């Protein structure tokens, strides 16, 4: 389950190639709680509505079960 | 009492339009506290009160 | 205390009346501890060190 | 002990900053509040105060050990 | 493993030699984990990818 939303986040991600991006691909590798949040929060005050909406997607999927 | 809450609250986030509330309204609708929480702070900081007021009012129906 | 130091923190921040210390009042209202911090954050942020000292009161105290 | 020098290292070099971070940093030391003590690091770090930041940063530690 | 990673992020962060580098390895020899994601939101916001990656990665290792 988790396998596909993960790879669809570090595609997505990766496709962006921005900065905050890049630092996003690996807070979804490691699947760290604190860094996916201060990736999401980046992507959102920088503008990418990609980035951060497919962070949120993958987080509420990896918040359960 | 969160579900009758969280329909004006997403009214109110598709009203603002900007691309930072149509983070919000997943937000919501998602029920995802650290995103509505993320949200919130974010709309506050550029200037939407209208979107972090009804944020903090459904996470305070959502908390009890 | 607390019922004191509540009062307090509302009319420092209707004194304010900044639109973010009436968000700050309804966080104080809900009594929303991430909204308190939240405000305090904000008010520290943009130059209103009052209010914000006042929400780490009423935070503290509660 | 170790606590009650830091503290009052801590608040001696917060006070000579006059900054209203400082005066923010020396409520957040005095009354003990770990939320207001982050807050208050991030934002002088932030500002360019490493000294304040700096002594935050080792009361802390000494206090949440 | 963590006494292995906590080299190379040292020695990365000292490289950077910018006041929010100064702060970061400090919050990696105290082992202040608030202290870390502070340093690593920081950096991102001021262009330091390379130190925001180690410091998750040194993170990651902390967390066990």
Redesign the interface.
């Known amino acids: 389950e988790l396998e596909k939303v993960k790879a669809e986040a570090l595609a997505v991600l990766a496709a962006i190639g921005s900065?905050?991006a890049?630092?996003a691909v690996?807070?979804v590798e490691?699947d760290?709680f604190?860094?996916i949040?201060?990736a999401?929060?980046?992507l959102?005050?920088i503008?990418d509505?990609e980035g951060?909406?497919v962070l949120?997607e993958y987080?509420?999927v990896l918040?359960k079960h």
């Open positions: 900065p905050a890049k630092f690996e807070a490691r760290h604190s860094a949040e201060i999401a929060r980046f959102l005050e503008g509505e951060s909406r949120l987080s509420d918040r």
